[PDB]
Amino acid sequence: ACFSTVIPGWFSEMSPMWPGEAHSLKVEKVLFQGKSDYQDVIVFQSATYGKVLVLDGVIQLTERDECAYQEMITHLPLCSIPNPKKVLVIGGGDGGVLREVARHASIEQIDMCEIDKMVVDVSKQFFPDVAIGYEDPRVNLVIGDGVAFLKNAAEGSYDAVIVDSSDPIGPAKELFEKPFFQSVARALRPGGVVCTQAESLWLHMDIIEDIVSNCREIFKGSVNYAWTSVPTYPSGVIGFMLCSTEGPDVDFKHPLNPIGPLKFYNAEIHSAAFCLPSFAKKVIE
Amino acid sequence: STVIPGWFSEMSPMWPGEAHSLKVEKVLFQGKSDYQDVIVFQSATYGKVLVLDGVIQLTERDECAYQEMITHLPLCSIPNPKKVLVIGGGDGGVLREVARHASIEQIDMCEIDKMVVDVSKQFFPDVAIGYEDPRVNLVIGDGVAFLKNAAEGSYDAVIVDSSDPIGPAKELFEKPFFQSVARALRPGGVVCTQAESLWLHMDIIEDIVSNCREIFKGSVNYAWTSVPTYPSGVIGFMLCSTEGPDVDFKHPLNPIDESSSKSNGPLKFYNAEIHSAAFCLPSFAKKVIE
Amino acid sequence: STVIPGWFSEMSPMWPGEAHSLKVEKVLFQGKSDYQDVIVFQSATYGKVLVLDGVIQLTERDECAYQEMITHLPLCSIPNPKKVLVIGGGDGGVLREVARHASIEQIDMCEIDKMVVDVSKQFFPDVAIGYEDPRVNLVIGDGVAFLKNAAEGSYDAVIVDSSDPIGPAKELFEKPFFQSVARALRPGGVVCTQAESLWLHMDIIEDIVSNCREIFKGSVNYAWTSVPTYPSGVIGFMLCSTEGPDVDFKHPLNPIDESSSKSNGPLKFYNAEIHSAAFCLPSFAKKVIE
Amino acid sequence: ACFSTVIPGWFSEMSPMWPGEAHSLKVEKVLFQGKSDYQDVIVFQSATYGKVLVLDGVIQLTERDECAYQEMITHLPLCSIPNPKKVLVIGGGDGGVLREVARHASIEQIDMCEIDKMVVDVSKQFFPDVAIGYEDPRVNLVIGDGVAFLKNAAEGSYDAVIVDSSDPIGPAKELFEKPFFQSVARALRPGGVVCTQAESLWLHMDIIEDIVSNCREIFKGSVNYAWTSVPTYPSGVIGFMLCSTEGPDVDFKHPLNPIGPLKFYNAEIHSAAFCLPSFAKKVIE
Helix, strand or coil: CCCCCCCCCEEEECCCCCCCEEEEEEEEEEEEEEECCCCEEEEEEECCCCEEEEECCEEEEECCCHHHHHHHHHHHHHCCCCCCCEEEEECCCCCHHHHHHHCCCCCCEEEEEECCHHHHHHHHHHCHHHHHHHHCCCEEEEECCHHHHHHCCCCCCEEEEEECCCCCCCHHHHHHCHHHHHHHHHHEEEEEEEEEECCCCCCCHHHHHHHHHHHHHHCCCCEEEEEEECCCCHHHEEEEEEEECCCCCCCCCCCCCCCCCCCCCCHHHHHHCCCCCHHHHHHHC | CCCCCCEEEECCCCCCCEEEEEEEEEEEEEEECCCCEEEEEEECCCCEEEEECCEEEEECCCHHHHHHHHHHHHHCCCCCCCEEEEECCCCCHHHHHHCCCCCCCEEEEEECCHHHHHHHHHHCHHHHCHHHCCCEEEEECCHHHHHHCCCCCCEEEEEECCCCCCCHHHHHHCHHHHHHHHHHEEEEEEEEEECCCCCCCHHHHHHHHHHHHHHCCCCEEEEEEECCCCHHHEEEEEEEECCCCCCCCCCCCCCCCCHHHHHHCCCCCCCHHHHHHCCCCCHHHHHHCC | CCCCCCEEEECCCCCCCEEEEEEEEEEEEEEECCCCEEEEEEECCCCEEEEECCEEEEECCCHHHHHHHHHHHHHCCCCCCCEEEEECCCCCHHHHHHCCCCCCCEEEEEECCHHHHHHHHHHCHHHHHHHHCCCEEEEECCHHHHHHCCCCCCEEEEEECCCCCCCHHHHHHCHHHHHHHHHHEEEEEEEEEECCCCCCCHHHHHHHHHHHHHHCCCCEEEEEEECCCCHHHEEEEEEEECCCCCCCCCCCCCCCCCHHHCCCCCCCCCCHHHHHHCCCCCHHHHHHHC | CCCCCCCCCEEEECCCCCCCEEEEEEEEEEEEEEECCCCEEEEEEECCCCEEEEECCEEEEECCCHHHHHHHHHHHHHCCCCCCCEEEEEECCCCHHHHHHCCCCCCCEEEEEECCHHHHHHHHHHCHHHHHHHHCCCEEEEECCHHHHHHCCCCCCEEEEEEECCCCCCHHHHHHCHHHHHHHHHHEEEEEEEEEECCCCCCCHHHHHHHHHHHHHHCCCCEEEEEEECCCCHHHEEEEEEEECCCCCCCCCCCCCCCCCCCCCCHHHHHHCCCCCHHHHHHHC
């Protein structure tokens, strides 16, 4: 599908999720093109954004700005709870989040559940500065379905669960509904936290409304929404749902356990991420 | 490779290898003035778009972000501003945002391209309405000039809604311009200027920060905000004060909440929290910008 | 004054105070390459339009006038041309016209902007078809360079389908360029170049003729033709031959009538009479051009 | 009607006669704006084309290029017949045509028939460069309907008739039909000639087809169509019908009687005007 372009010899990210607009990157060379039992996988060398991973036509990450997403999705939750030891990451086709999780010395075990082995393979072959994450001694890589993995999880066995989901377009829509969240809340120790990728405030204020609603129904601890700059994601921003279960209080706005050096995240950035714009703040409240 | 027809792509050397594209609903106007290529078109999902020299200048959908931030970050950081100057007509949205401040007595608007103002007045409502405020003194002419002929210390604030430092507007980023702004400002006066993106032009920004640090004896701060339609998705701002009463840009002194201008409509983007957050820079930039 | 929406206007300093406008049916593509702003749109009454750097480059409705003239004025003035070079054939129409000549064995096409070639191939059928001829050797690169590395006297004719001498293409009108063309041409070879309008740039034209007169020992002639979509409605051409067999540009030696290329379709504009007429200049220009 | 514009502060020439396109000139200042009993009249100082006359939204002339039209319409016919003495001109007038007719020494009388007095007045007041033509001793200016004047003309009393008509949009469409042409043929001396403004080959090949047809039926002498460059007229070109009546032959292609100096017209240009483009040549033939 080298047709998804609005500019000759370029790749344009298009989808019903963000109609009437598209992000395009100049393609230098296509390194990998294949189709798994789950999705279309493409890796191309961009001209100015490094290597780019594309799943079902959606940009998953680029070497130039992975840091922002990977660093925020990991530390917002991880730096908000004391001495995290066991952590679950769902769908980390990349290793970057893993690399970021492992940055926390207190961690003892990092379970990884990615359903498409092709992603892990492609990632390991073309993205070195992150595939490195799969190599940590504490990483327990599991190739299977996340909602299932979590459904079979021992109760209260995790300090944190990070859901690096994709767009709630197909089968991954399950990762945004109540059943799944209840599943996560059960797997979390009391006062444990979850960090879910929760779309853009500029594009899906409706979807975000339901997500905030479901979490507020499942989680009796804190329920917050944070957003961050990620140039390569539609609208330039991406959000996160930060939730904690019944138990010790968790203040996601003020990192209690602050941390190569970090290229994006820092204590200021951490609380800044929870300051939503008025139009969004109104609804989410 | 075959293109899908019906799309407009924002492309430029200022941001090589990448492009924001919008589905064109209908062309409202496309010409060329003595200064720039001007385009006004109906986009499919972002309302009307204004494009200058091929660079999206604004969208009805997210113009609030830029206008509100560029206007209120400086104006909410000082007490009762009365005389404010805005360089770069652009569209009048900033103008509408300045009008929210009740204390303002006079607003000088200095735009060099009348075609831009004309087309804006015609195709944009919640924008061309700014030019209508009695306090607005619209002057069509070169801004750097207008500032040179400005009475020393006669302004409480200066807002530079410039474009990219690609054309002759590169001056608006040079030291000579900032010196002119400084003298035109009362002591303790503030300036806010469009200052590119941390993701694309760290180099440039670094020079801009230096220039302002050598010209302004008050406080110098860089802020950034989300603006979906500008390249990289974020845009920067230089907030500077001249020697005199101290200015704390990080903590708004008088942030507009809503009742502040109950009749102007609520603010869609800006709020006191977003104000402080705007000054929290990511690590890679934080080190370089000090 | 209020504008009627839905129109595209061609404006330039090269022709101040005037403008040609077209009702836009639908935007087919609008972006920017490393070299220029590229626009392809469906006009209401002129079919598809290609616009480069803001200047209408061709229209389906009248491209025949430009293409046929620039191609056949030189190609019908010499016996059996075999190796022809086209510089900057941004659309491939000139190409299609060159292909009408059965004696042609090889056509070198040198276009510097691949985006143009790409967008043309996609939206312009009759035009893009040209690139398909077996004799066509398409080369994406700088034309002036391609010509410097050209074997001396290897071409029978050179067609420069340049744009306006506004950007870096101003070289294509300079003496160094013409000297390169001359060396690349066989003795008695011919060159035809777009050479602005008698109504708008007498000054420029005058310099062009001088440059040509100092470089070409053969015959130098200026011709003009009607092209409704180019500013002023007419376009000019420089027809020069190098020292060698005499070349009579005023009287076509082998004009294409129709049976000449029965299978290519009939010419929509060119013919032997129009050929001679092209060289009849109005009085105000006749004196100045000698 | 200062709305007929597609560019702020500019004048745009638009009309159903040439849909989807428009010629625009930058307006410096509007000198005259009025409405006669016949049409809307406007005179504005253009930025780069001198003063401009506009009738019913259509540019009638500009100081910068009037030479082309006025010189071609008068000399194509006048340089084709030997010793012309009596001439009739019908049309929006401006004196440019008169000024050009008066360039012929042999001429003894120039009947001028303009129906809208306002046009003559406005022309006289703002266009001294052509109001001058009204002041020649041989000019008999008649304010009235041309069709009528011509219908009352004495038989075979003119050597040449020049119809500087406007577009065949309204009441002037009559000046393009057979009755009027027979009227002209009656008023012309044997071997006499007519020169009529005959639209643009690029825009009205069909109307031009009817005109050529009609003339071909009425005139038994020569019937030729010629076109000329006129930047300010839609398409950049304008055509002319050249016809001669039964009698002494007339070779419109080769001026038998060649002539401030001329700024456009010349012998070469004269015959070049009869060389039409293939697509037009085919139909007209």
